[PDB]
A = this chain, B = another copy of it.
Amino acid sequence: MHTAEFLETEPTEISSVLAGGYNHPLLRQWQSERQLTKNMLIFPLFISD
């Protein structure tokens, strides 16, 4: 029977674990370099004669 194989692995290296920083919704905001504010938007206008 084709069985599910599992390789022999070593203990987890701390340096591989990044998931501790983006597992919560608020963290996904915490991870951004800069947040989006309304006073960041420039609306274009096309004036006609």
Interface residues of A (CB under 8 A from B): 26, 29, 33-35, 37, 39-40
Which residues from B are CB-within-8-Å of A29? 39
> Are A37 and B39 in contact, CB atoms less than 8 angstroms apart?
no
CA distance A35 to B39 in the complex (A): 10
Which residues from B are CB-within-8-Å of A39? 26, 29, 35
CA distance A36 to B33 in the complex (A): 12
CA distance A33 to B37 in the complex (A): 13
What is the distance, in angstroms, from A39's C-beta to the closest C-beta of chain B? Answer: 6
CA distance A34 to B39 in the complex (A): 12
CA distance A40 to B48 in the complex (A): 43
